[PDB]
Design a protein around this ligand. Structure first.
Ligand SMILES: CCCCCCCCCCCCCCCCCC(=O)OC[C@H](CO[C@@H]1O[C@H](CO[C@H]2O[C@H](CO)[C@H](O)[C@H](O)[C@H]2O)[C@H](O)[C@H](O)[C@H]1O)OC(=O)CCCCCCCCCCCCCCCCC
Ligand SMILES: CCCCCCCCCCCCCCCCCC(=O)OC[C@H](CO[C@@H]1O[C@H](CO[C@H]2O[C@H](CO)[C@H](O)[C@H](O)[C@H]2O)[C@H](O)[C@H](O)[C@H]1O)OC(=O)CCCCCCCCCCCCCCCCC
Ligand code: CLA
Ligand code: CLA
Ligand code: CLA
Ligand code: CLA
Ligand code: CLA
Ligand SMILES: CCCCCCCCCCCCCCCC(=O)OC[C@H](COP(=O)(O)OC[C@@H](O)CO)OC(=O)CCCCCCCCCCCCCCC
Ligand SMILES: CC1=C(/C=C/C(C)=C/C=C/C(C)=C/C=C/C=C(C)/C=C/C=C(C)/C=C/C2=C(C)CCCC2(C)C)C(C)(C)CCC1
Ligand SMILES: CC1=C(/C=C/C(C)=C/C=C/C(C)=C/C=C/C=C(C)/C=C/C=C(C)/C=C/C2=C(C)CCCC2(C)C)C(C)(C)CCC1
Ligand SMILES: CC1=C(/C=C/C(C)=C/C=C/C(C)=C/C=C/C=C(C)/C=C/C=C(C)/C=C/C2=C(C)CCCC2(C)C)C(C)(C)CCC1
Ligand code: OEX
Ligand SMILES: [Cl-]
Ligand SMILES: [Fe+2]
Lengths: 75, 333, 450, 136, 340, 50
């Protein structure tokens, strides 16, 4: 079926007005609730530096990277 | 039959090995003198002070240069934008000391390329074809004018023009990056897109056309020998090429009116180069690219570096070093 | 719909306006409506700038582009380039808006309900693109209108409150130009001089007297030419070198207007007379000269003997000698020694930069002007970060000179491209092979081999 | 880390008394400073006279001390040389030279207090770039 | 046979050709594109480069990137289950495993695309020149994104998938290797510019030598795909270009083969140059000029000026470009020219 | 150099000698085109009549 016929179909828009806005709102809430910071480990604007360290938190070892990051990302 | 008529006729003749035309009367002497002066200067031009600080720079082959390091050094900074023909100097040696040959060569080259465009159109008219090839050639001409004439006009000195050489070209590009941030300018992005797309479309069009070639030759004979000059039928199968292209990406997405295809081929790189020449021209008047320096700030206020800040770091490194002795005050205006 | 379809016309929708070439009334409607669009933009932008105006900052820091013109005309500006009131700008804006409404209605009426061809019903406004007498008549009428406009500017500057003059004694202010220069030699010296450095073909007009005299001359020439083209007919020598068609006329106009756009772009970048630095900000060279001047003054305050300190290259870091012998500021700004600014001329003598005036008779207002100009140079970025490309983004400023020059240079080149395209197509169409070759009368096959 | 109470405390007077800038003050300052001071004092350096910088160290060595809010506010009211021998109001923006410089024709006290607070506070945040220059 | 009807369904005619090559083209390419999309949106570069490269942290399209892994990790594959990460998606993203994920998956998708071109050509019964042409971009990707970091200290010095990151890569190679002076780069730029030249000139020549095949000004509607005769005069174009330039094409097959050949060989030469750089075998200095300048302080060319620019960019960029080295350069150590 | 200048003639010799070239061209052009007053073609860029 050609694209234009589907795009102009009414039964298409009756299944694309309860699916698209819901997905958009879910994508909004993904970061509005702050879940994305925890899922990907990216720092929040107030987590770049802490009271203990005032410099960039670089990883120096390879096979102990997990523990190093765990420590750096303490506070 | 007068003499003028006879002449005009020989000039606009279409049976001469090379078309002369009326634009040729401007193209030939001008380009010939430009190339003669360029060839002589690339071999035996004495050093020239370019920054006007009495520190001459050698650019000739006979002065310990090679093909890459050699160049025709642009005129001195003391002259600036002033016209400096031979007869304004008190001696030819002095004319060479202040880089007059650069001005001579560049002005003649610009006039020659403009006349070349005109001559392309004139022959198109004589042969009874559609007159728009010189419109396509306008893009390199615009780029050359921007790099050789418009930028010195905006900056205020001929010493800021592109030197005629390889290493000089690289130096010009690096200093342009340092002082102007060409990479972060959307017009340079458009030009890179245009050039990459031109190469892509050239390669793909050539592959599609050569792949679908009607079998009219053996195996022990160049495939190119199947085609004969002055044919009446297409030597390639458009149907097979379009089928392959449509199956490769998508059915809708595909060109059929080969005329539209060739128009798009002409359109992409030309508009890219036009936009790039406009980038250079706009930046000649100090309208630089985006400056995303210290744009990201944490809650407290400390600055978090992005990839743009490292670009600024490299630009600083280039800037504090270019023309080391020329500057006396903190700002480069 | 007979005239509005690729079939009836032969022109695709994207190149749709070409269907109006032979339609007289609709073309007139399109032209009038477009003029209304221009007027509407002028009025709307003036009102916008008046709304966003802030009396603390100078106009060149507020990103303004139109208040400067009306200020140069001498509207609501006081001594030194201070803005007194913004009422005349508001009046100009509203008048332009109303006139734009009228023009837009007229254009719409002539495009929609007006007769398609004016030749049948109004055999005075109808033309043919091919007869020369009517073409020259229209050209002469509009030429007379332009001459009257130039007169109007001269009249405004001479007897209607005057214009703003930076070089006026006691500082920049509005004055009457009582004695414009009428000498043809001095006026046409600008027109016929070199366009290179130190000459400044038409950009290097210095005083307001030359501006007024040149405008008097342009108005007189335009009036005489308009009268002359109306009466006469194109001569034999011009009758066989020109293509006589609508697209050819369009191409001629495109080339001329591209040249004018280039001239205006370079004119806004170098000129201080018709573009006072108090309104448009300092020019390119002006900022560099201001930097050299202010650092010279600062180092002189410490007691250093200016004009005796050798630079790092041994050339002199404060005062140098121009290649013509004139005494100029040192450093990289020696390329800009042709500069002439109202705040630096008091220090210039016949030999160049006088030294006794620099050592003793310096003024605080010159110091303030130089510092302000150095701190506001025509440097910036596309997002208007301001300053040098490597500077951090705290200031927010791009000089209007840069905007004007860049935009108009871009437009001028693209109109040159339009000239190329349209001239080629017009000549090909007049010749008769703008659609193809022929396939039965191919001229290449009739020519000798080579 | 946030712009907490600890980092918003600055010296208010010669003695050493330390007041606290409300967040609003900070904003207004950064705005006013960037609008008026920024063109010449961007980044905490003096563009026209690089010797007399704006970093806290140079303010500490001025005569009199300029490393507190009160002295900065007084300097705006009445600017002097680096050693304080005479006034330079005719060649520097100031309330005294309000006629000469139209920018200050509207500045208020709180405005001056906020600008001085911003000047004092920014070196506490950046701590090495306020007045540093290109290098940093 | 079970294989036969599966092969029949794979080569079914539909909107998009799947083919056998699709089995590794579609998942790998989809995963590479998705990895780039998630990388420039959520994951950061704080713990590998000390940067912020994501929309979540405030970068625009020009600055967001998928940055290379930390230099402390060597040429490790950074597998999600590897010893460096041991599962735990968050730390895998933080140490920079997404770069390797994207690069490896994109390389396999690239292989899949070349195989897809071969299969399409075989099914349609035409010559496979398209795959040979596409071999150029494959060589560029392999030499730049795989071989160059492999020759260097770690993945850290590979280009990052981002707009500004590529600019940083350009400037880094210019500053450290004098890449513009390398003759193979000169060949590459010659090939690329010649390809653009050929494309524009051929388009213009074909479009301006069309035949009278209609009556309307719009010449696009005077063409039909199932046409036998040629639409433009080869003879007239040949004569025009021989009268203007001096030499012109007289063979469409040779013309289009040249159009194919130029950019591909440009890219191949550039790739050879990059492979050379990977081992620091760079065309940096002209020994003769370096000497003759060392023994005489009056000799100067644009070449020595370029060297000074390289030293400046290197010294001023190293501190922030390589945070793992902990470079500290005092102000009096940094090379700087005069007052500026 | 920067001395403004009507055109760029500095010495009467330079003007009086840039003269004969243009006048030589005017004469050779007049040789073909002389005694022409009418012959209005009234067509789009025709100029067919010599
Ligand atoms: C080829 C050979 C032809 C060269 C023609 C181009 C030269 C343009 C040029 O040198 O332009 C410079 C001059 C500007 O002149 C400047 O004029 C200045 C005038 O300022 C003086 O006057 C001012 C007025 O107060 C102030 O006083 C200022 O302080 C004082 O110095 C100074 O004299 C400068 O030295 C002088 O350079 O432009 C002009 O006069 C106007 C130029 C007309 C526009 C030309 C278009 C530019 C070409 C673009 C081509 C695009 C490519 C298309 C082809 C494809
Ligand atoms: C054509 C189209 C191709 C189709 C595309 C296919 C895409 C597939 C993707 C390829 C994946 C390749 C990953 C290989 C990882 C790598 O290499 O990983 C690197 C390891 C080698 O490990 C490195 O080894 C180095 C040497 O260390 C040695 O020396 C050290 C001395 O201090 C210590 O002693 C250390 O313990 C000891 O191992 C350092 O340790 C590095 O940190 C460590 O990364 O090799 C290995 O895994 C394997 C090495 C075998 C060589 C095979 C790879 C070929 C690469 C050739 C590169 C030549 C250089 C470039 C030339 C230009
Ligand atoms: C300044 C721009 C401009 C102007 C003045 C015109 C003018 C014209 N075009 Mg046109 N055109 C333009 C841009 C412009 N065009 C562009 C950019 C394209 C490319 C898409 C085209 C493509 C195009 C085609 C393909 C054709 C025209 C045609 C025409 C003519 C008849 C149009 C018509 O019948 O309208 C009919 C349309 C309407 C009635 C709907 C528009 C309703 C009104 C006019 C909109 C404006 C209302 C305004 C906001 C209210 C103000 C009221 C006032 C009192 C304040 C007319 C002279 C036609 C032609 O050749 O005529 C013979 C034709 O076939 N044009
Ligand atoms: C006063 C100036 C002027 C005038 C009256 C004309 C008039 C004409 N031109 Mg034309 N042209 C001009 C300047 C001018 N041109 C310039 C400067 C160029 C160089 C770029 C061209 C290049 C040009 C070409 C290449 C062609 C014409 C054609 C035509 C004819 C039909 C045009 C049409 O229907 O428009 C239709 C208008 C549009 C489709 C609008 C397109 C919008 C453009 C592409 C983008 C504009 C970007 C804008 C600056 C900002 C965008 C904002 C956005 C981000 C929201 C008509 C006689 C056609 C022709 O040959 O007819 C015989 C044709 O093929 N012109
Ligand atoms: C360049 C601008 C321009 C030009 C050339 C014309 C030309 C013309 N207009 Mg007109 N018009 C214009 C602007 C213009 N108009 C504007 C701006 C408006 C809006 C106020 C109008 C509103 C308008 C109306 C309402 C009518 C015309 C009419 C006419 C035609 C006869 C006019 C007449 O008898 O004048 C004689 C003057 C001297 C001999 C003529 C072709 C008339 C027409 O064609 O309809 C019959 C008509 O009724 N015009
Ligand atoms: C917009 C301005 C403008 C335009 C487009 C034209 C256009 C034209 N003029 Mg011109 N002219 C103008 C202003 C203008 N004039 C002015 C202001 C004057 C007064 C000095 C003259 C005095 C003038 C003379 C004396 C002659 C022309 C001639 C011509 C024609 C040939 C032009 C040529 O080859 O050069 C052409 C129709 C020539 C022509 O064909 O005469 C009819 C001719 O001999 N013009
Ligand atoms: C055909 C599509 C395809 C291809 C070619 C790849 C290829 C790759 N993926 Mg991958 N992936 C795919 C689809 C694909 N993926 C899909 C659909 C997903 C979503 C679930 C993922 C999710 C994914 C993740 C999350 C990761 C990869 C990674 C990788 C890379 C390393 C994989 C590795 O080492 O395992 C190689 C595995 C094999 C060779 C197994 C092949 C099957 C064997 C031969 C069957 C027989 C074995 C037998 C049972 C053993 C007998 C006993 C033994 C003792 C002999 C590699 C480039 C990793 C990576 O790039 O990290 C940087 C990584 O972390 N992929
Ligand atoms: C435990 C051992 C598991 C594998 C057993 C062999 C299965 C062969 C099935 C297939 C088979 O033998 O049937 C024959 C099959 C063709 O199937 P058809 O359905 O066309 O055959 C119809 C009849 O001719 C079958 O006799 O041949 C293939 O195409 C082989 C393809 C490579 C198959 C590779 C299989 C091994 C994969 C790796 C296994 C893990 C590592 C060990
Ligand atoms: C034909 C055509 C066309 C065109 C059209 C035209 C071009 C039109 C124009 C139009 C116009 C051009 C219009 C205008 C209008 C205007 C108006 C409507 C105005 C109004 C005003 C007002 C209302 C004001 C008010 C005010 C005041 C008084 C004060 C202050 C405030 C304010 C401002 C509010 C087109 C393209 C579409 C399409 C095709 C067809
Ligand atoms: C206002 C003013 C001024 C001005 C004045 C005047 C008086 C002007 C004029 C102007 C003029 C007086 C101009 C003229 C121009 C001309 C031209 C521009 C020409 C051109 C020509 C042509 C283009 C031709 C062509 C051709 C040829 C070459 C060949 C054959 C064909 C033909 C014919 C086409 C001044 C600056 C003083 C000052 C300020 C104010
Ligand atoms: C990595 C990974 C993965 C995967 C994932 C995925 C596969 C994802 C996907 C994702 C995606 C797939 C996403 C996408 C996104 C998109 C977007 C975000 C877009 C945007 C767009 C826009 C923004 C546009 C723009 C534009 C243009 C471009 C042009 C025209 C104009 C406009 C404006 C429209 C997994 C799970 C396996 C796990 C492991 C890791
Ligand atoms: O000459 Mn070539 O590079 Ca244009 O900026 Mn200023 O001048 Mn020099 O420094 Mn930077
Ligand atoms: Cl300087
Ligand atoms: Fe082709």
């Amino acid at each position: 079926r050609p694209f234009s016929d589907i795009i102009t179909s009414v039964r298409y828009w009756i299944i694309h007005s309860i699916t698209i806005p819901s997905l958009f709102v879910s994508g909004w809430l993904f970061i509005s609730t702050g879940l994305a910071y925890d899922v990907f480990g990216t720092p929040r604007p107030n987590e770049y530096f802490t009271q203990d360290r005032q410099q960039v938190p670089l990883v120096n070892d390879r096979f102990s990277a997990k523990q190093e990051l765990e420590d750096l990302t303490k506070g | 039959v007068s003499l003028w008529e006879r002449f005009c006729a020989w000039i606009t003749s279409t049976e001469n090995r090379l078309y002369i035309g009326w634009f040729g009367c401007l193209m030939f002497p001008t380009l010939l003198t430009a190339t003669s002066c360029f060839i002589i200067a690339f071999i035996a031009a004495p050093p020239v002070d370019i920054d006007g600080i009495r520190e001459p720079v050698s650019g000739s082959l006979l002065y310990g240069n090679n093909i890459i390091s050699g160049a025709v050094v642009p005129s001195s900074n003391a002259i600036g934008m002033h016209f400096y023909p031979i007869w304004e100097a008190a001696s030819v040696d002095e004319w060479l000391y202040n880089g007059g040959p650069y001005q001579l060569i560049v002005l003649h080259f610009l006039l020659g390329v403009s006349a070349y465009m005109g001559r392309e159109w004139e022959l198109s008219y004589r042969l009874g074809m559609r007159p728009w090839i010189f419109v396509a050639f306008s893009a390199p001409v615009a780029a050359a004018s921007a790099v050789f004439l418009v930028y010195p006009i905006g900056q205020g000195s001929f010493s800021d023009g592109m030197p005629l050489g390889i290493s000089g070209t690289f130096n010009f590009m690096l200093v342009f990056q340092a002082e102007h941030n060409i990479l972060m300018h959307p017009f340079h992005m458009a030009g890179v897109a245009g050039v990459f797309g031109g190469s892509l479309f050239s390669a793909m069009h050539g592959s599609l056309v050569t792949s679908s070639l009607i079998r009219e030759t053996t195996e022990n004979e160049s495939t190119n020998y199947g085609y004969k000059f002055g044919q009446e039928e297409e030597t390639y199968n458009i149907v097979a090429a379009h089928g392959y292209f449509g199956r490769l990406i998508f059915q809708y997405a595909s060109f059929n009116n080969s005329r539209a295809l060739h128009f798009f081929l002409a359109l992409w790189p030309v508009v890219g180069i036009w936009i790039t020449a406009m980038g250079i021209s706009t930046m000649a008047f100090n309208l630089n690219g985006f400056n995303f320096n210290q744009s990201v700030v944490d809650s407290q206020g400390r600055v978090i570096n992005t990839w743009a800040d490292i670009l600024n770091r490299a630009n600083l490194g280039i800037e504090v070093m270019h023309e080391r002795n020329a500057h006396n005050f903190p700002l480069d205006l | 719909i007979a005239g509005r379809d690729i079939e009836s016309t032969g022109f695709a929708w994207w190149s749709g306006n070409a269907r109006l070439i032979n339609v007289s009334g609709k073309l007139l409607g399109a032209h009038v409506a477009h003029a209304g669009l221009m007027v509407f933009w002028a009025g709307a932008m003036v009102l916008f700038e008046v709304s966003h105006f802030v009396p603390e900052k100078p106009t060149y820091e507020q990103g303004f582009i139109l208040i400067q013109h009306l200020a140069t005309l001498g509207y609501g500006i006081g001594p030194g380039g201070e803005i007194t009131s913004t009422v005349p700008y508001f009046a100009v804006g509203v008048i332009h808006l109303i006139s734009s409404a009228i023009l837009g209605f007229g254009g719409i009426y002539h495009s929609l309900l007006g007769p398609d061809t004016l030749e049948e019903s109004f055999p005075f406004f109808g033309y043919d693109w091919r007869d020369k007498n009517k073409m020259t008549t229209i050209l002469g009428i509009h030429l007379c209108l332009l001459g009257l406009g130039s007169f109007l500017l001269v009249i405004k500057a001479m007897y209607l409150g005057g214009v703003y003059d930076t070089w006026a004694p006691g500082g920049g202010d509005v004055r009457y130009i009582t004695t414009p220069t009428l000498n043809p030699i001095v006026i046409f010296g600008y027109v016929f001089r070199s366009p290179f450095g130190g000459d400044g073909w038409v950009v290097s007009v210095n005083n307001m007297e030359d501006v007024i005299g040149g405008h008097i001359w342009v108005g007189i020439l335009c009036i005489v030419g308009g009268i002359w083209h109306i009466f006469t007919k194109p001569f034999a020598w011009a009758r066989r070198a020109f293509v006589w068609s609508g697209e050819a006329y369009l191409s001629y106009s495109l080339a001329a207007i591209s040249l004018m756009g280039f001239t205006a772009a370079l004119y806004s970048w170098y000129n201080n007379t018709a573009y006072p630095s108090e309104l448009y900000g300092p020019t390119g060279p002006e900022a560099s000269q201001a930097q050299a001047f202010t650092f010279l003054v600062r180092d002189q305050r410490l007691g250093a003997n200016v004009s005796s300190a050798q630079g790092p290259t041994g050339l002199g870091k404060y005062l140098m000698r121009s290649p013509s012998g004139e005494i100029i500021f040192g450093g990289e700004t020696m390329r800009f020694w042709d500069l002439r600014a109202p705040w630096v001329e008091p220090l210039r003598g016949p030999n160049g930069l006088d030294i006794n005036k620099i050592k003793n008779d310096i003024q605080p207002w010159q110091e303030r002007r130089a510092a302000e100009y150095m701190t506001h140079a025509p440097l910036g970025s596309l997002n208007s970060v301001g300053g040098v490309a490597t500077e951090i983004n705290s200031v927010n400023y791009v000089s209007p000179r840069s905007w004007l020059c860049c935009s108009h240079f871009f437009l001028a080149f693209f109109f040159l491209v339009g000239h190329w395209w349209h001239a080629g197509r017009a000549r090909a169409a007049a010749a008769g092979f703008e659609k193809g070759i022929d396939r039965d009368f191919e001229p290449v096959l009739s020519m000798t081999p080579l | 880390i946030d712009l907490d109470e600890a980092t918003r405390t600055v010296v208010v007077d010669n003695a050493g008394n330390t007041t606290v800038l409300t967040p609003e003050q900070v904003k207004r300052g950064k705005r006013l400073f960037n609008a008026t001071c920024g063109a010449c004092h961007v980044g905490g350096i003096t563009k026209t006279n690089p010797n007399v910088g704006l970093d806290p160290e140079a303010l500490s060595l001025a005569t009199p001390r300029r490393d507190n809010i009160n002295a900065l506010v007084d300097y705006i009211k009445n600017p002097t040389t680096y050693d304080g021998l005479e006034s330079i109001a005719e060649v520097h923006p100031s309330i005294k030279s309000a006629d000469i410089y139209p920018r200050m024709r509207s500045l208020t006290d709180e405005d001056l207090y906020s600008i001085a607070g911003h000047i004092m506070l920014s070196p506490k945040i950046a701590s090495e770039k306020w007045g540093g220059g290109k290098i940093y | 046979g079970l294989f036969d009807l599966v092969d029949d369904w794979l080569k079914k005619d539909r909107f998009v050709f799947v083919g056998w090559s699709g089995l590794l083209l579609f998942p790998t390419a989809y995963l590479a594109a998705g990895g780039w999309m998630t990388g420039t949106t959520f994951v950061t570069s704080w713990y590998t480069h000390g940067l912020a490269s994501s929309y979540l942290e405030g970068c625009n399209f020009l600055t967001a990137a998928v940055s290379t892994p930390a230099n402390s990790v060597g040429h490790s594959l950074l597998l999600l289950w590897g010893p460096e990460a041991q599962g735990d998606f968050t730390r895998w993203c933080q140490i920079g495993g997404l770069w390797t994920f994207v690069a490896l998956h994109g390389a396999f998708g690239l292989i899949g695309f070349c195989l897809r071109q071969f299969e399409i050509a075989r099914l349609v019964g035409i010559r496979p020149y398209n795959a040979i042409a596409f071999s150029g971009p494959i060589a560029v990707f392999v030499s730049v994104f795989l071989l160059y970091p492999l020759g260097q200290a770690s993945w850290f010095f590979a280009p990052s998938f981002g707009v500004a990151a590529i600019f940083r890569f350009l400037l880094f190679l210019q500053g450290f290797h004098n890449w513009t002076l390398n003759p193979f780069h000169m060949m590459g730029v010659a090939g690329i510019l010649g390809g653009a030249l050929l494309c524009a000139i051929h388009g213009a020549t074909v479009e301006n030598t069309l035949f009278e095949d209609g009556d309307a000004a719009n010449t696009f509607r005077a063409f039909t795909p199932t046409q036998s005769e040629e639409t433009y005069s080869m003879v007239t174009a040949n004569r025009f270009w021989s009268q203007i330039f001096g030499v012109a094409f007289s063979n469409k097959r040779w013309l289009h083969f040249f159009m194919l050949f130029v950019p591909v060989t440009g890219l191949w030469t550039s790739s050879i140059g990059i492979v050379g750089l990977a081992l620091n075998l760079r065309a940096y200095d002209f020994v003769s000029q370096e000497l003759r300048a060392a023994e005489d302080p009056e000799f100067e060319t644009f070449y020595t000026k370029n060297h000074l620019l390289d030293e400046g960019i290197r010294a001023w960029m190293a501190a922030q470009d390589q945070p793992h080295e902990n470079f500290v350069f005092p102000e009096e150590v940094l090379p700087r020219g005069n007052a500026l | 150099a920067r001395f403004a200048n009507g055109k760029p003639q500095s010495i009467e010799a330079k003007y009086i000698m840039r003269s004969p070239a243009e006048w030589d061209r005017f004469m050779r052009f007049m040789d073909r085109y002389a005694e022409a007053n009418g012959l209005g073609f009234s067509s789009x860029x025709x100029x067919x009549x010599x």
